[PDB]
């Protein structure tokens, strides 16, 4: 079970260790954010803003702007336009787990809307590990099954003649995706698999998948072989490590969004305008999203101020609601849910809501209908369940554009204001538009983001929408990450308060123990398993159990890493470690005092 785990390097021998060389780029500590844990709000914005800018940064080897990556994007666009040209029996599937799965969902929503707007039959669908509940709730463990991935692909592809499958896994990690890519390669007469991730192939996970005979790396290596025959594609740009180690939702999610929107827009442009995809045109679009970073981060003071407000509500046991209009609602939903595993947040802490029509977005909306408070997301959910329960300690962030129903925005804001003064808005506008006077009065310090009109004949309106979603993503992700960082929920730039919700998170938790204690792999495994299973003592059956067993027990538990870490550092029992942790003001300070 633990064979792939490398021994902890000896004290002082970390620098050039085989241990450090094997850490995937997606899991690496960013050298610029080692001080993230103790940074103030303004400094967190600068650190996270710098990291977000890194996805665009042109060694030029395998970067997003590299000739190699742009050529792969051109080839994939070529394959997609072949399907768009033949809608009968054609299908474009986007798939993933967690944020990658929610990005697949968003991509399908956006591109089916583009197609509907042009009077064409929609050809996109999404597959998310765990089904529709995973779009709005933390169900990370569902991606650990390759068979689940294959079954969901077989269902949507039934009766189709040509299926493009874009498998999204930032760390080249998700078994759900690996299974799909492998089965696509077994039938190239029907399927064209495209693997999207942000690690070199040699850094893809090589640990065993519980229900599959191939590892992610073996599948990715087979994809490299099929790429020589143009029967598969590996689209893996280099973006560098995340500001918060392994926080794939940030840079990884942003790079997934821009990469896929750019190449898919190019495929649609080929069919509609007759202009084939090119490195030059892909760069023009990508650089528009690069300009969006400068536009967004020019609001750094207000982002920092909002982060403080959100952190205050959380610290007081209040809740934070991100209320977004149309697709900005999807971005809002994606933000809150990630706080659960990342910082050990309760599902009630940060929740996103979509205001507007969501009727043609979900595959199986019945999976969400009256399922419980962990699954709220809609306009009806916000107005009927959240709004009447709002208190003075809660924060509500409103995200909209000046093309939204501003009477409806004003009405909802006023209703919320009766319950709490902790209101703020992120409003996107086109140069020339001004916020109505009642809204300026309700939001005297509004985060106003003004966008020049884009004159791209075909892509103009789509990029306008996409950049506003991306801008919203950066603001909300910096605010939610920062708000939890300010509460001492991280250590250096590592997720100390992480929930072990899937196998990738289990390995990240083990690596963190080895990193922070410097103790042997056997000692770190023993302490991690003891902390997960407590009060159940460790037995040989538990030590030999599959990782899924540890995940199932660990997923609803809080502070597993600091408990396991304090147990290693003090050579104490779990109860003694729990006492040490309870006496401290934060999880960051408890461990810092022990170190």
UniProtKB/Swiss-Prot annotation:
A cellular component annotation (GO) from this entry: cytoplasm
Identification of the protein by name: Glucokinase regulatory protein
Compartments, as annotated in UniProt: Cytoplasm; Nucleus; Mitochondrion
Region named Important for interaction with GCK: 189-190
One example GO MF annotation: kinase inhibitor activity
Span list, region Essential for interaction with GCK: 453-455
Species of provenance: Homo sapiens (Human)
Principal subcellular localization: cytoplasm
Binding site for beta-D-fructose 6-phosphate: 99-100, 169-171, 504
UniProt keyword annotations, A-Z: Carbohydrate metabolism, Cytoplasm, Mitochondrion, Nucleus, Repeat
Pfam families the UniProt entry points to: GKRP-like_C, GKRP_SIS_2, GKRP_SIS_N
Cysteine disulfide partners in this protein: none
Domain statement: Fructose 1-phosphate and fructose 6-phosphate compete for the same binding site.
Tissue expression notes: Found in liver and pancreas. Not detected in muscle, brain, heart, thymus, intestine, uterus, adipose tissue, kidney, adrenal, lung or spleen.
Origin: domain of life: Eukaryota
UniProt similarity note: Belongs to the GCKR family.
